[PDB]
Amino acid sequence: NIILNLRYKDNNLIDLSGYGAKVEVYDGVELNDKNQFKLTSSANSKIRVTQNVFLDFSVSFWIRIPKYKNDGIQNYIHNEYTIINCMKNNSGWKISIRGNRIIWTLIDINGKTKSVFFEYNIREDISEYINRWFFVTITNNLNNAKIYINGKLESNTDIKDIREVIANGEIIFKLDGDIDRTQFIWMKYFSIFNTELSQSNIEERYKIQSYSEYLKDFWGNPLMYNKEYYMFNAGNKNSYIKLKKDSPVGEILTRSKYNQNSKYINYRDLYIGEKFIIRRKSNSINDDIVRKEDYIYLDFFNLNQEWRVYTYKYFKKEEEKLFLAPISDSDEFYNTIQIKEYDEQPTYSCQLLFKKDEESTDEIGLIGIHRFYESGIVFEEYKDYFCISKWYLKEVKRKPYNLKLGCNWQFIPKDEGWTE
Amino acid sequence: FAELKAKFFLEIGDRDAARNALRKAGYSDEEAERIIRKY
């Protein structure tokens, strides 16, 4: 039921539908072999698709929309811009964005218009949508326009009043509107179908196009070795790891927040805590992507020295503080971590299992966060620390898998799409 | 590093393991004990 299927092949985009649409990718479009493409604000950043009665039809694609600039928030909220336009004789459809809102507009032959949209929150401590790959699907039948986000129905618009909408027009991928120079958009897997896709089908496609042998970072891009990452905890979203002053352990602190006074904006800072870096058991090499079940060392930088995250071999309680220390071999600690992804649903979270070596059947425990007793004349009697725990060994077997377990981590690199 | 070890064990409330790590370095159980009372 596919009538257009844009995919990457050899530094270009082509139609694989077999209906042979002509695709002109202009020099302003950045492409990669992960099928991601980038529309920027410069004039040559566009794609023209020339394709060879009331018709049901559906569009799906992935999109990654960058965070607002804090100092440019008014126009982000105010200014709508088209990113994909498909019109003939002033009739057709368009996909637009006005700030934190993505919009689907239908235009009949008479110019009569209807829209359906999805809006995400820009006051969330930590957002699931901002500058993160998510999945979009819009369906149209005789009576309704629907938007699905990540397989789930989000909005519905009655389009009974509309009239014949012309669909054969050329499709223009280009940012069009009163935008800032720094504005851009990433897209992936653009598709069009000659039927209204059912919620069941969208969900299956969501899961299938979510599949990868590799792991992903917090933004949704492939997880990499030898790349600097801040760490996020899905069970403790506002917390972060810092090497404790004068002690070789990771204390856990609360993220700082947006500290100015725009009334449209709130978020927690993401670029804080230690800069971690994932290495290889053996060991630095070109574009090495991290895969499920890989064996790694979890390292980080401490004043131009590379330190590593250890566990004591012989910890006595159900959980214990991790040891953060220089790279060294020791009879007393494990350093071998196996990176895991226990969730069976789409996710960017992973788990970090300590192990004896690469051949062992023994599971020592999973890295997470726990509260420990503070001795002496202190403020608080308990404090959060960067830990290993045997308890998660039990909890990761429960089904369905818990998205919010404190043994679920994501890795956050600096990214042009998030500034704070 | 050996000193980071000892500091680690005090931080996890394992004062004996700390003495074990220092003596392994290896230190005098008197100097070692002072080091500990100091941290």
From Swiss-Prot, chain A:
Changing residue 391 to L: Greatly decreased toxicity, heavy chain has decreased binding to synaptosomes, heavy chain has dramatic decrease in GT1b binding. Gangliosides no longer increase heavy chain affinity for SYT1 or SYT2; whole toxin significantly less toxic. Residues 1-210 are annotated as: N-terminus of receptor binding domain (N-RBD). It is a multi-pass membrane protein. D-galactose binds at residues 369-370. Changing residue 333 to A: Greatly decreased binding of heavy chain to host SYT2, whole toxin about 30-fold less toxic. A ganglioside GT1b (d18:1(4E)) binds at residues 156, 318-319. It is found in: Secreted; Host synapse, Host presynaptic cell membrane; Host cytoplasmic vesicle, Host secretory vesicle, Host synaptic vesicle membrane. Changing residue 325 to K: Greatly decreased binding of heavy chain to host SYT2, whole toxin about 1000-fold less toxic. Changing residue 318 to L: Decreased toxicity, heavy chain has decreased binding to synaptosomes and to GT1b. Residues 211-420 are annotated as: C-terminus of receptor binding domain (C-RBD). A motif (Host ganglioside-binding motif) lies at residues 389-392. Has 3 functional domains; the translocation domain (TD) and the receptor-binding domain (RBD) which is further subdivided into N- and C-terminal domains (N-RBD and C-RBD). HC forms channels in bilayers at low pH. The N-terminal belt of the TD wraps an extended belt around the perimeter of the LC; it is shorter than in BoNT/A and does not block the active site. The belt may be a pseudosubstrate inhibitor which serves as an intramolecular chaperone for the LC prior to its translocation into the host cytosol. Responsible for host epithelial cell transcytosis, host nerve cell targeting and translocation of light chain (LC) into host cytosol. Composed of 3 subdomains; the translocation domain (TD), and N-terminus and C-terminus of the receptor-binding domain (RBD). The N-terminus of the TD wraps an extended belt around the perimeter of the LC; it does not seem to protect the active site, but might prevent premature LC dissociation from the translocation channel and protect toxin prior to translocation. This is Botulinum neurotoxin B heavy chain. The chain holds residues 863 to 1291 of 1291 of the full protein.
